[PDB]
Amino acid sequence: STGSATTTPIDSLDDAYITPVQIGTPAQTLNLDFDTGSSDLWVFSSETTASEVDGQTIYTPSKSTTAKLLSGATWSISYGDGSSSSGDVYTDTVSVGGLTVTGQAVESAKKVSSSFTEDSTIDGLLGLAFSTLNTVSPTQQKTFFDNAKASLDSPVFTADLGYHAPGTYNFGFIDTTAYTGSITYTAVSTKQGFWEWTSTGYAVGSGTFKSTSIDGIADTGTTLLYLPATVVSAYWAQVSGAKSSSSVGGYVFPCSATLPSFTFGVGSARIVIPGDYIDFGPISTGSSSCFGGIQSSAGIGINIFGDVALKAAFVVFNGATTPTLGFASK
Ligand SMILES: NCC(=O)c1ccc(F)cc1
Numbered sequence: 001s002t003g004s005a006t007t008t009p010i011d012s013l014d015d016a017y018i019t020p021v022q023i024g025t026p027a028q029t030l031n032l033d034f035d036t037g038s039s040d041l042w043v044f045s046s047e048t049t050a051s052e053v054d055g056q057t058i059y060t061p062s063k064s065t066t067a068k069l070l071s072g073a074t075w076s077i078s079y080g081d082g083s084s085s086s087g088d089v090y091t092d093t094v095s096v097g098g099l100t101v102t103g104q105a106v107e108s109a110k111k112v113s114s115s116f117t118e119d120s121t122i123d124g125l126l127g128l129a130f131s132t133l134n135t136v137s138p139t140q141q142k143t144f145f146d147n148a149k150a151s152l153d154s155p156v157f158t159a160d161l162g163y164h165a166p167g168t169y170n171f172g173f174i175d176t177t178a179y180t181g182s183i184t185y186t187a188v189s190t191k192q193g194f195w196e197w198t199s200t201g202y203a204v205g206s207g208t209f210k211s212t213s214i215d216g217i218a219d220t221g222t223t224l225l226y227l228p229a230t231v232v233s234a235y236w237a238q239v240s241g242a243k244s245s246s247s248v249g250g251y252v253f254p255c256s257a258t259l260p261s262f263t264f265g266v267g268s269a270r271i272v273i274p275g276d277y278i279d280f281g282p283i284s285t286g287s288s289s290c291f292g293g294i295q296s297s298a299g300i301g302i303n304i305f306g307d308v309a310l311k312a313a314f315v316v317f318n319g320a321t322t323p324t325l326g327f328a329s330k
Pocket of ligand 1: 033035037079080081082083125221222223
């Protein structure tokens with residue numbers, strides 16, 4: 001089997017991407033944030049505290065003839081931005097782009113933190129990291145991908161995120177029309193539950209490539225590119241007036257600037273992130289100070305190849321017995 005679904009930016013900055021997902025019978029379509037940095041499929045629901053729901057579409061398990069309470073199961077997750085959610089668990093039929101999994105754990109939120117409530121466009125998350133990170137207790141549950149894997153034509157999914165435009169998540173096949181040149185594959189460590197890999201270096205603009213190992217995760221659920229402070233300083237030093245602002249919480253730059261590209265290495269190959277991709281716009285409405293799309297990972301504890309990096313590439317998440325990651329230009 002295969003599936004193919006379009007993923008769409010939630011706003012004009014590409015802060016996140018949503019993909020429609022069918023849950024239950026008859027189908028209830030929710031727009032979920034596909035997140036290769038976590039492993040829970042959770043949704044706003046009829047059980048979510050009413051004051052914490054603001055415009056989201058909810059899953060109502062009592063209206064699904066295939067929903068079954070997973071008795072005794074609870075979940076609770078925190079994310080890197082300090083947001084969180086928790087609740088109980090149903091199993092139900094879940095379909096993405098024509099690919100169906102029966103008996104998928106659908107984690108129903110009883111509580112969500114303010115950032116989720118405030119984002120009307122995201123109805124939940126669909127985790128695509130390794131199932132070892134799944135938070136369901138006392139019986140850990142499998143991701144949608146893990147459940148689908150054995151049935152797929154090939155045990156892979158691909159992320160093809162757009163810059164200020166829709167893109168595609170495919171399951172079970174590689175669309176050879178969706179990228180230019182070849183796909184370069186690179187080793188993955190699953191020890192921390194993430195799609196963790198090692199970039200071979202970077203360049204700023206037209207500058208010389210610096211060969212240096214940068215361990216990090218491929219994370220569709222993180223907006224920005226978070227790299228070591230040395231690398232990030234070298235980038236922003238090429239932008240007149242750019243500075244790290246403790247008050248704002250990262251590098252800012254004059255909105256009048258023209259940003260250089262940023263290249264990262266994948267083996268001997270190179271992925272170029274255009275300068276425009278690194279612009280996240282005014283820090284507040286009407287400001288002439290703009291927020292940078294490349295930020296320091298210092299304090300996070302890991303480097304994160306988030307959407308800023310991934311949307312410059314066609315990315316293969318290869319879930320074969322020994323997982324790997326592939327990157328192609330597009
Ligand atoms: N950096 C990822 C992160 O903080 C996040 C936050 C919320 C979420 F639902 C997914 C990801």
